Amino acid sequence: NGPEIMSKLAGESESNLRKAFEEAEKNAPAIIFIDELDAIAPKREKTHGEVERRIVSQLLTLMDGLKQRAHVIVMAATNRPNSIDPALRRFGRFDREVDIGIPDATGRLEILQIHTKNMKLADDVDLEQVANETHGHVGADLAALCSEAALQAIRKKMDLIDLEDETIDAEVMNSLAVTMDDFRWALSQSNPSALRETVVEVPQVTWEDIGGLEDVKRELQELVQYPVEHPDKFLKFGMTPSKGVLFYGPPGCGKTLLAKAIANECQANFISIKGPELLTMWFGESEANVREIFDKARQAAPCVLFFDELDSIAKARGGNIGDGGGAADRVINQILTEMDGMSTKKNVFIIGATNRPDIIDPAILRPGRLDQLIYIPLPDEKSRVAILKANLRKSPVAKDVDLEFLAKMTNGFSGADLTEICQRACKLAIRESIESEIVPEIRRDHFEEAMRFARRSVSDNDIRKYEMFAQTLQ
Amino acid sequence: PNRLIVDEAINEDNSVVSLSQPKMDELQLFRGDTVLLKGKKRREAVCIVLSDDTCSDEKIRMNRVVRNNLRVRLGDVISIQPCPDVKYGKRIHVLPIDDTVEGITGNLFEVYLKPYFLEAYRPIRKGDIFLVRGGMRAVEFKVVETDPSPYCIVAPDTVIHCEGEPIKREDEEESLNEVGYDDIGGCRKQLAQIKEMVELPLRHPALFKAIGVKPPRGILLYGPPGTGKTLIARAVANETGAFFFLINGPEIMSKLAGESESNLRKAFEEAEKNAPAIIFIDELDAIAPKREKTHGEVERRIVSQLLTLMDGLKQRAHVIVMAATNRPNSIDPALRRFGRFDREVDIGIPDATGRLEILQIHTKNMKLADDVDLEQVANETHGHVGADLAALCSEAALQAIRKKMDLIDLEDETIDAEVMNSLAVTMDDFRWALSQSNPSALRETVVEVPQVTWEDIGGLEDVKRELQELVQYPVEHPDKFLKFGMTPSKGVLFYGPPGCGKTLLAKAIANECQANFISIKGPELLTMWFGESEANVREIFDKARQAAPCVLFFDELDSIAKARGGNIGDGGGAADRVINQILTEMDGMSTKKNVFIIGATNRPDIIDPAILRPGRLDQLIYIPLPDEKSRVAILKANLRKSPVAKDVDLEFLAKMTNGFSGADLTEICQRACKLAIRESIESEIVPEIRRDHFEEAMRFARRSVSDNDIRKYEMFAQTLQ
Amino acid sequence: TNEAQMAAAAALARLEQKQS
Ligand SMILES: Nc1ncnc2c1ncn2[C@@H]1O[C@H](COP(=O)(O)OP(=O)(O)O)[C@@H](O)[C@H]1O
Ligand SMILES: Nc1ncnc2c1ncn2[C@@H]1O[C@H](COP(=O)(O)OP(=O)(O)O)[C@@H](O)[C@H]1O
Ligand SMILES: Nc1ncnc2c1ncn2[C@@H]1O[C@H](COP(=O)(O)OP(=O)(O)O)[C@@H](O)[C@H]1O
């Protein structure tokens, strides 16, 4: 590990590193694990000391010596593949890389189950519920979470039994159950170490969660699955598979869910880039970070890289009128460059979404980029019913609630607007339930009252704007 | 039987122990009865049991003096029994401790023991230690001989004797002037959090080494200098009995290459040999600063050496390393990774209540005059930390001392106890010291529970209820939100005319919820925009998480949109640098951190619509100009503390001020006060604010919100339907 | 007994002075 080698004096750090390789050879087959590699051999441009420069060169020569040190494999751990001397990653040496990433909701449940194997849990403990709440945690944080929950349970009993001796009674610990209240307390004390890290995971959104859009669902399967499920037909007919599709249409119609649902069915990692991230790069003149986004997509492949609010910068530049320049800007140009350098053989599919297609840099729509365009309209009557059922799928809706009549009334509503009705009715049911303790279901009265405030967010002036664009594309 | 846990006391009185009423009936004793407490090494203490409404049913609350007499520590268990046959004594012989009476001479009985014993009816047992404060000294005494035995109550006719040499302190008896938990004023929440983390593995080491659950190994305390980071570390070690080893940056960095690394390693070896032990590293940023900020071989090596020593704590059982820094991000990020320093506590700056507690602590030995009001001082000492309040008390003491010493002219090697004992520090000496003191945390972020309550806000009855639903229900009734599949709102935006109470609403709900209030004002959002330092938004939202539960209030949310031209604007759109970072942080924030975001704007028509989407400030509340019944309530609230004459007709004023905002009604209240002050001052060259003062104030006060601006808000509210 | 009752009145009075 870095600290062990770097804490030594000049002439001792290089010697100890050499000895480690000699010991592994004598005991071959052997694995040498170098943790905190960035502390031993950081990028050369970031250091000028003689000790740091020598230890970089010494590690490089020891790695090259592995041509003779048969059956010795050297593994290393770093935070970023570009924090270390690029020489280490050249043919030979450290020429294989694996991206461990951050556990997803399923992995977090598995980690919680592992670090509770020895713990007696009460019947009210639900580790899946915990795994869903522990957003941004890594395994080290879930291990600390289980430890803190255990200690809270221990304190509650130990202060009551008052048994102080040299050893612990096995029966006392064996009958100690950790309740959900102790996990909830530990969750309040835990502080995730990866809260601001990029989240890359297979989305839990499935096609059953999206109302309507039956034809788009089929089209996306043809765009995303066929090039890899039936590659021999594309070669046979000389077809060049599309690299991505742009969604356009009114806001709140399911553009994001479509990208997630196809990523889920394909079991591909979903990478979400939101408007504020594209604006952050534009505002701070840090568009170079686009290269790391597309490189992450390659690392996580197969994956779907979704660029939401693709017009966020065009709007920030004035949108309807704009400024003194043209459609091109700093961030989109880096997106265009990375797409041109990306091969379809990496199984990375690019999806965009915009609420204002009339101000998207036309370059993104040329062959080789987001050449396919799908219109996502406001849901029709049969779709709005499906949307209400999907949004209420987990709610205790009373049998007296007529969702077909509601769909008829909400003629001009988007899917997001139907959700506001669903959540507003839920809020009303909660308020009444809480008051009854100072109710078992969401009653028709709650949905009827919700309709007093819910409104369509998409006006007819904006609907025509989308129709005119769609008509241009045939 | 009758075995209760030893807890902390609120009453400092050395002869009083607090027990909850149900234990008075189980022990069959009456309120104020005399009981014995059974401690360790066949020792006991006699005290009077009183009841209160704060003691836990299963705990006994006793101060440091009683615990030391019993040779017990917080968290232990002692037995309590009544002793109704206690009688009075006639003779008590008390001698001072050699280690506490130094440099001071005089009649110890008249100064210390007489006011302590006389008519106090204290129980005393042979061998008891007790502390008497006065004359700016803390002098402890031991009782060596009494006529009755083993204990008695001192009567008004009991004679107190004191002859012989001072008593040499026993090696197993700690001085009562050592740092303990009762020396810490504010930041009680942080002290409790730390105690939970450290007291269990230090008091019960057999628990952790016998189970698969590992203890915390490293706790990083952070906050401005002078906030008690070292004071806590010392109090913890002294209260639990763990061996305390002190490290500080200057001591390690002043050494040569090969000596600094060796001395740091030795510190860990010494703690292990004396385990359980606490290693406190002050000025950690001076030892292991962020690597990107240093390139020297000595600084790089000492970072690596500390990291390896912290990792060695897997074998160094029962050793906890605490560190103090100014900022959690000033040090090598490696230190904060799993293990090492993976627990953090934000000490912060004491609030008005904590500052009063600190002033009371650092005046325990001081004789204060009847005109001294430490609560008034605590309210004036904005921006001060405990180190500054300690200096404030010292400066006030010295000013009082100089005034008397220059008059009595007594110069000798020792000081007369009577001279100091009769020296009272007046409010003028504290006010003088306040003018000389200079707060060290004047520009630091202020995070505290607001003193604004609902009684301070006139009108808006429906908004008050709405905030309770938005802020309290998601955490008081979480099972209903899960049951109905509801996603709690993350925040609300207030919009409406200026001066209608938008800020008070955010403070009042934070107060009722007992949550920390963080105020971000227009100039701060503009500073980040103008200086292209919008990255500082991440630190604001991270502070909200650190201080949770809290309410993070963004006032003047349109300040940048207006700075960009407002009504016309510039060549861009609604988005800007600072609001974009706010949007990013909100999206990454979970409702499980109990952080509620509130915004306020006077120009909702120019707020970036992104902030109003689900997941952001999706709720919108309109705060109108107050109506007639509200304006009366506003006048009464603003005048709540003013000596308003009975002839002032506040309902009549409310009828006239039809178009006034709450801020405009305040100008009337303050303008009338100014007029009353002017007349009062002139009368000395008046006892109340007269109708004439309010009538004259009405000659200048005008509505600040015109009808053109009222419609602007109504049209927006209509757009929201 | 009565000496404990006299201590009771004195302890209660000092507690009220500290709480007020
Ligand atoms: N077709 C649909 N089926 C089900 N829910 C929908 C649909 N369209 C919109 N919604 C609801 O609207 C919300 C926003 O949808 P999203 O696709 O995120 O909008 P956008 O793509 O404009 O950001 C979702 O949470 C979803 O509940
Ligand atoms: N919360 C507090 N309560 C009481 N005294 C305090 C508090 N915070 C600071 N002080 C006082 O201020 C001083 C703080 O100095 P110290 O603990 O050495 O801090 P530092 O680590 O910054 O050197 C001490 O005299 C201490 O008694
Ligand atoms: N409803 C109200 N009740 C009592 N005082 C009010 C009310 N509205 C405004 N005020 C007075 O106006 C002043 C400014 O209020 P504030 O909420 O700070 O304005 P803003 O939110 O526009 O900054 C406060 O000091 C308060 O005394």
Side-chain angles (χ1 to χ4, degrees):
Chain A
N1 61 76
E4 183 64 21
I5 303 301
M6 290 297 101
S7 70
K8 305 293 188 284
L9 301 173
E12 297 173 340
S13 64
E14 300 91 353
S15 180
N16 288 339
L17 186 64
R18 291 196 299 268
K19 289 178 181 179
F21 278 72
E22 292 173 353
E23 291 297 312
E25 184 178 28
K26 288 190 287 185
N27 292 281
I31 298 167
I32 300 171
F33 180 72
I34 301 167
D35 201 347
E36 302 184 55
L37 178 62
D38 53 293
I40 298 170
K43 187 177 183 183
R44 285 173 179 267
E45 291 180 354
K46 301 295 187 182
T47 182
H48 60 275
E50 290 187 1
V51 174
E52 292 78 9
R53 294 289 182 90
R54 282 196 294 266
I55 202 70
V56 167
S57 294
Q58 186 66 74
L59 181 59
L60 289 166
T61 58
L62 288 166
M63 287 303 295
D64 290 345
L66 294 170
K67 292 179 181 178
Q68 299 298 306
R69 302 179 195 277
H71 317 303
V72 178
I73 298 168
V74 182
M75 299 179 76
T78 191
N79 291 336
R80 291 288 187 275
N82 63 347
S83 68
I84 60 171
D85 182 353
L88 287 161
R89 297 165 68 197
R90 294 172 187 168
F91 182 75
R93 295 159 187 174
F94 291 102
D95 58 7
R96 271 79 168 185
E97 303 184 43
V98 180
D99 187 5
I100 301 303
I102 299 166
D104 62 12
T106 299
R108 290 198 295 272
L109 173 56
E110 289 174 307
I111 293 167
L112 289 167
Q113 291 170 347
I114 291 165
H115 289 262
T116 56
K117 284 180 171 179
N118 297 328
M119 289 170 66
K120 180 177 173 68
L121 305 177
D123 289 344
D124 58 308
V125 175
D126 184 332
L127 295 176
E128 184 173 355
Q129 181 63 39
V130 174
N132 287 334
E133 294 180 22
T134 50
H135 186 74
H137 292 232
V138 298
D141 297 313
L142 298 172
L145 179 66
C146 293
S147 180
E148 287 295 314
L151 293 176
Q152 186 62 58
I154 291 166
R155 285 195 291 271
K156 286 176 173 173
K157 184 170 186 178
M158 291 296 166
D159 288 341
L160 300 175
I161 66 175
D162 196 26
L163 305 180
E164 180 68 21
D165 208 330
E166 183 64 20
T167 63
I168 197 162
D169 291 298
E171 295 81 1
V172 168
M173 290 304 291
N174 189 61
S175 61
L176 171 65
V178 181
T179 66
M180 188 65 190
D181 289 343
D182 295 337
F183 280 96
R184 287 172 177 169
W185 175 87
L187 284 168
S188 294
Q189 296 292 302
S190 178
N191 293 278
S193 63
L195 184 62
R196 293 192 295 273
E197 297 290 309
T198 302
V199 178
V200 182
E201 65 182 39
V202 177
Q204 302 302 302
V205 175
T206 184
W207 294 121
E208 296 177 359
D209 297 312
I210 301 168
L213 303 173
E214 294 82 0
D215 291 288
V216 174
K217 294 175 179 168
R218 286 189 286 271
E219 183 175 0
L220 292 172
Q221 291 169 337
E222 294 176 353
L223 291 169
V224 176
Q225 294 177 333
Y226 282 12
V228 297
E229 294 296 323
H230 306 281
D232 58 308
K233 272 72 185 176
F234 285 83
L235 291 168
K236 179 180 175 68
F237 287 100
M239 180 69 194
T240 299
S242 174
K243 294 192 187 184
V245 62
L246 174 65
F247 292 122
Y248 68 94
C253 299
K255 294 197 276 287
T256 299
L257 293 175
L258 290 166
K260 288 179 177 178
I262 189 66
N264 186 11
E265 183 172 46
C266 300
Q267 294 290 287
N269 284 312
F270 183 73
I271 303 168
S272 175
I273 307 300
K274 302 290 285 186
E277 185 168 359
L278 295 169
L279 286 169
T280 295
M281 290 186 282
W282 180 62
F283 276 123
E285 298 186 350
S286 57
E287 65 276 0
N289 289 343
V290 171
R291 292 198 294 272
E292 293 180 354
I293 292 168
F294 272 88
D295 209 77
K296 185 71 169 182
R298 292 183 183 91
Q299 294 163 33
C303 69
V304 177
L305 177 59
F306 179 61
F307 287 97
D308 200 355
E309 301 184 66
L310 196 63
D311 55 308
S312 68
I313 295 166
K315 290 190 293 192
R317 290 176 57 208
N320 292 339
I321 304 301
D323 61 12
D329 63 45
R330 289 191 286 273
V331 175
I332 196 69
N333 288 333
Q334 291 295 302
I335 290 169
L336 294 169
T337 299
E338 284 292 301
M339 290 181 78
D340 285 346
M342 180 174 272
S343 172
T344 57
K345 297 290 180 174
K346 296 293 290 185
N347 301 310
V348 178
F349 190 73
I350 311 302
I351 299 180
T354 182
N355 298 314
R356 290 293 307 272
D358 53 302
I359 58 173
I360 298 296
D361 181 353
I364 199 67
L365 306 180
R366 294 174 188 166
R369 289 86 178 267
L370 303 181
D371 63 309
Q372 302 296 300
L373 291 99
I374 297 172
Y375 178 48
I376 307 303
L378 290 170
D380 63 12
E381 183 172 323
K382 70 181 188 284
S383 297
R384 290 196 297 277
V385 172
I387 292 169
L388 288 165
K389 288 178 178 178
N391 285 326
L392 297 169
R393 187 171 183 173
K394 296 182 179 179
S395 294
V397 177
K399 69 182 182 181
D400 60 326
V401 177
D402 184 341
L403 296 176
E404 289 75 12
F405 179 57
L406 176 58
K408 289 178 188 288
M409 292 189 289
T410 56
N411 187 62
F413 283 50
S414 71
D417 296 326
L418 296 171
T419 300
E420 181 175 352
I421 293 165
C422 294
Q423 287 286 297
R424 187 175 294 276
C426 293
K427 181 179 177 181
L428 293 168
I430 290 166
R431 184 180 67 193
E432 182 173 356
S433 180
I434 291 168
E435 288 176 354
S436 78
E437 293 183 347
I438 301 167
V439 175
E441 59 182 357
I442 304 166
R443 296 182 296 108
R444 183 185 297 171
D445 290 344
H446 298 132
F447 280 93
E448 288 181 352
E449 286 293 310
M451 282 300 291
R452 294 179 68 197
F453 303 96
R455 297 288 186 275
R456 61 188 284 186
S457 295
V458 180
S459 68
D460 286 339
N461 290 339
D462 292 332
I463 293 168
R464 287 194 294 273
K465 290 174 193 168
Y466 300 112
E467 290 172 350
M468 289 187 285
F469 187 77
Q471 286 170 359
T472 298
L473 299 172
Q474 305 298 304
Chain B
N2 303 331
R3 296 182 70 251
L4 284 87
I5 295 167
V6 177
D7 197 12
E8 298 181 24
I10 296 167
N11 187 358
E12 296 174 21
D13 185 354
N14 295 334
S15 296
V16 173
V17 67
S18 171
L19 272 97
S20 183
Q21 178 67 50
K23 293 295 184 181
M24 290 182 162
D25 294 294
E26 291 179 358
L27 299 168
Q28 292 285 285
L29 61 91
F30 62 91
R31 292 177 181 180
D33 198 359
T34 304
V35 306
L36 304 177
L37 306 176
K38 307 288 188 175
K40 293 184 177 185
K41 298 187 178 181
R42 299 184 180 178
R43 294 180 61 89
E44 64 182 358
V46 57
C47 59
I48 303 300
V49 180
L50 307 182
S51 62
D52 65 27
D53 55 337
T54 60
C55 183
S56 175
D57 288 344
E58 303 301 325
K59 300 189 182 183
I60 297 172
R61 284 188 166 180
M62 61 185 77
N63 71 7
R64 288 174 61 186
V65 172
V66 173
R67 289 199 296 275
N68 284 348
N69 285 330
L70 297 171
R71 295 293 203 262
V72 303
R73 294 176 177 279
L74 289 165
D76 289 336
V77 179
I78 60 97
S79 299
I80 180 165
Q81 68 180 75
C83 64
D85 57 336
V86 64
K87 300 289 281 174
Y88 59 84
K90 302 296 291 189
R91 186 172 67 92
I92 302 171
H93 190 178
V94 182
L95 298 172
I97 308 302
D98 193 56
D99 296 332
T100 196
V101 175
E102 182 177 358
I104 183 164
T105 61
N107 184 324
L108 290 169
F109 172 71
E110 291 295 323
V111 174
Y112 295 105
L113 300 174
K114 178 177 177 180
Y116 183 76
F117 286 126
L118 179 65
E119 295 182 354
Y121 296 96
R122 298 181 184 279
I124 300 102
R125 186 183 193 283
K126 182 178 179 181
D128 280 354
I129 308 299
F130 64 95
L131 180 66
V132 185
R133 298 185 184 276
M136 296 182 187
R137 297 289 296 268
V139 179
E140 51 183 21
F141 297 88
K142 177 172 187 175
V143 181
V144 295
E145 184 173 297
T146 59
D147 279 342
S149 66
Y151 58 89
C152 66
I153 291 167
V154 64
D157 61 331
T158 301
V159 179
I160 308 301
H161 297 253
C162 186
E163 177 61 284
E165 295 294 323
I167 297 164
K168 296 290 183 180
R169 185 166 55 88
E170 297 182 13
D171 54 317
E172 294 184 355
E173 184 168 275
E174 294 181 355
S175 171
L176 293 169
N177 288 327
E178 292 292 340
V179 174
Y181 291 147
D182 61 331
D183 295 312
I184 301 164
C187 303
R188 289 186 185 279
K189 289 180 177 179
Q190 292 89 336
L191 181 61
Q193 185 181 39
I194 293 165
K195 285 190 293 191
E196 289 176 353
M197 291 189 287
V198 302
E199 289 189 341
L200 181 66
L202 296 169
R203 297 295 302 157
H204 303 278
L207 169 62
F208 274 93
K209 73 183 188 180
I211 63 175
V213 182
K214 303 296 186 182
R217 289 181 171 88
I219 300 166
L220 177 66
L221 308 182
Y222 61 93
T227 60
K229 297 191 285 286
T230 301
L231 183 66
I232 292 166
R234 287 181 181 277
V236 168
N238 289 342
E239 292 282 11
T240 65
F243 171 72
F244 185 81
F245 192 105
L246 177 66
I247 300 171
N248 61 76
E251 183 64 21
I252 303 301
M253 291 297 101
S254 70
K255 306 293 189 284
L256 301 173
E259 297 174 340
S260 64
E261 300 91 353
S262 180
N263 288 339
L264 186 63
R265 291 196 298 268
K266 289 178 181 180
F268 278 72
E269 292 173 353
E270 291 297 312
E272 185 178 27
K273 288 190 287 185
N274 292 281
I278 298 167
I279 300 171
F280 180 69
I281 301 167
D282 201 348
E283 302 184 56
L284 178 62
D285 54 294
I287 298 170
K290 187 177 183 183
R291 286 173 179 267
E292 291 180 354
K293 301 295 187 182
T294 182
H295 60 275
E297 290 186 358
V298 174
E299 292 78 9
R300 294 289 182 90
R301 282 196 294 266
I302 202 70
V303 167
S304 294
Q305 186 65 73
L306 181 59
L307 289 167
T308 58
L309 289 166
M310 287 303 295
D311 290 345
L313 294 170
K314 291 178 182 178
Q315 284 77 49
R316 302 178 195 276
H318 319 302
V319 178
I320 298 168
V321 182
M322 300 181 79
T325 191
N326 291 336
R327 291 288 187 275
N329 63 347
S330 68
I331 60 171
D332 183 353
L335 288 161
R336 296 166 68 196
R337 294 172 187 169
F338 183 75
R340 294 158 187 175
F341 291 102
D342 57 7
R343 271 78 168 185
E344 300 182 49
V345 179
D346 187 5
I347 301 303
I349 299 166
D351 62 12
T353 299
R355 290 198 295 272
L356 173 56
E357 289 173 308
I358 293 167
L359 289 168
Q360 291 170 347
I361 291 165
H362 289 262
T363 56
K364 284 180 171 179
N365 297 328
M366 289 170 66
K367 180 177 173 68
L368 305 177
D370 289 344
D371 58 308
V372 175
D373 184 332
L374 295 176
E375 184 173 355
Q376 182 63 39
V377 173
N379 287 334
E380 293 180 22
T381 50
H382 186 74
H384 291 258
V385 298
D388 298 313
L389 298 171
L392 178 66
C393 293
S394 180
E395 287 295 314
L398 292 175
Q399 186 62 58
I401 291 166
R402 285 195 291 271
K403 286 176 173 172
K404 184 170 186 178
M405 292 297 165
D406 287 341
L407 300 175
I408 66 175
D409 197 26
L410 305 179
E411 179 67 20
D412 208 330
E413 183 64 22
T414 64
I415 197 161
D416 291 297
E418 295 81 1
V419 168
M420 290 304 291
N421 189 61
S422 60
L423 172 65
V425 181
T426 66
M427 188 65 190
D428 290 343
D429 295 338
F430 280 96
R431 287 173 177 168
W432 174 87
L434 284 168
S435 294
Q436 296 292 302
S437 296
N438 292 281
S440 64
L442 184 61
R443 293 193 295 273
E444 297 290 309
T445 303
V446 178
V447 182
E448 65 182 39
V449 177
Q451 302 302 302
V452 175
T453 185
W454 294 122
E455 293 178 352
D456 296 310
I457 301 168
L460 303 173
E461 294 82 0
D462 291 288
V463 175
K464 294 176 179 169
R465 286 189 285 271
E466 185 170 2
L467 280 167
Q468 293 173 335
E469 293 178 345
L470 292 169
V471 177
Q472 289 175 247
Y473 284 8
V475 297
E476 293 179 355
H477 304 282
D479 57 308
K480 273 73 185 176
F481 284 83
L482 291 168
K483 179 180 175 68
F484 287 101
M486 180 69 194
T487 299
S489 174
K490 295 191 188 184
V492 60
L493 175 66
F494 285 110
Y495 69 94
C500 299
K502 294 198 278 288
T503 299
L504 293 175
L505 289 166
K507 288 179 177 178
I509 189 66
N511 186 10
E512 182 168 50
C513 300
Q514 294 290 287
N516 284 312
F517 184 73
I518 303 169
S519 176
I520 308 300
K521 303 291 285 187
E524 185 169 358
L525 295 169
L526 288 167
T527 295
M528 289 187 282
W529 179 62
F530 271 112
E532 298 187 351
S533 57
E534 64 276 1
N536 289 343
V537 171
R538 292 198 294 272
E539 293 180 354
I540 292 168
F541 272 89
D542 206 75
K543 184 71 169 182
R545 286 189 284 271
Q546 293 164 33
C550 68
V551 177
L552 177 59
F553 178 61
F554 287 97
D555 200 355
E556 301 180 66
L557 197 64
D558 55 307
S559 68
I560 295 165
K562 291 191 292 190
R564 290 176 58 208
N567 293 339
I568 304 301
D570 61 12
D576 65 47
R577 289 191 285 273
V578 175
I579 196 68
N580 194 64
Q581 289 294 305
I582 290 169
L583 294 169
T584 299
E585 284 295 302
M586 290 181 78
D587 284 346
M589 178 175 272
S590 172
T591 57
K592 297 292 181 174
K593 295 293 290 184
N594 302 310
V595 178
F596 190 73
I597 312 302
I598 299 178
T601 182
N602 299 314
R603 290 293 307 272
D605 53 302
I606 58 173
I607 298 296
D608 181 354
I611 200 68
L612 305 179
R613 295 174 188 167
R616 289 86 179 267
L617 303 181
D618 63 308
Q619 302 296 299
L620 290 97
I621 299 173
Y622 177 48
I623 306 302
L625 291 170
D627 63 12
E628 183 171 325
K629 70 181 188 284
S630 298
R631 290 195 296 277
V632 173
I634 292 169
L635 288 167
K636 288 178 178 178
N638 285 326
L639 297 168
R640 184 181 293 280
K641 296 182 179 179
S642 294
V644 177
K646 69 182 182 181
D647 60 327
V648 177
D649 185 338
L650 297 177
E651 290 76 10
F652 180 63
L653 290 169
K655 290 179 187 290
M656 293 174 72
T657 56
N658 187 61
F660 282 49
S661 70
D664 295 327
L665 295 171
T666 300
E667 180 176 353
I668 293 164
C669 294
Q670 287 286 297
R671 188 176 293 275
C673 293
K674 181 179 177 181
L675 293 168
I677 289 166
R678 183 179 68 192
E679 182 172 355
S680 180
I681 291 167
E682 288 176 355
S683 78
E684 293 183 347
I685 301 167
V686 175
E688 59 182 357
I689 304 166
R690 296 182 296 108
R691 183 185 296 170
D692 289 342
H693 298 133
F694 281 93
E695 185 66 21
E696 286 293 310
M698 286 299 291
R699 294 179 68 198
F700 303 95
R702 296 291 187 276
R703 61 189 284 188
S704 295
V705 180
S706 68
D707 286 338
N708 289 337
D709 292 333
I710 293 168
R711 286 193 290 273
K712 289 174 192 169
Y713 301 112
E714 291 172 348
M715 288 188 286
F716 184 76
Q718 289 168 350
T719 298
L720 296 172
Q721 293 284 289
Chain C
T1 189
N2 287 339
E3 293 79 4
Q5 187 64 52
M6 290 191 288
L12 287 165
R14 290 195 300 273
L15 175 62
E16 290 176 354
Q17 291 170 345
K18 180 67 176 178
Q19 290 176 333
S20 179

